[PDB]
């Protein structure tokens, strides 16, 4: 899904696929967290849990 690799400071997964390039939208179970919100742009929640 997405996490900052604390050694290399490089994202991965669906967050890292659109921060770093090759995606325009991420319609997927991407939980709204603070460390993701600083780099990507979430909608309002379509599902609560």
């Amino acid at each position: 899904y997405g996490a900052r690799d604390a050694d290399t400071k490089i994202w991965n997964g669906m967050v890292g696929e659109l921060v770093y390039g090759k995606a325009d939208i991420a319609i997927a179970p991407l939980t709204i967290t603070l460390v993701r919100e600083e780099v990507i742009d979430f909608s309002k929640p379509f599902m609560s849990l």
């Binding site: 997964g13 669906m14 696929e17 325009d24 939208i25 991420a26 319609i27 997927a28």
Partner: peptide
């Protein structure tokens, strides 16, 4: 216009 590239899992 271009095709928007969804990335699901």
């Amino acid at each position: 216009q271009k095709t928007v590239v969804v990335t699901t899992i």
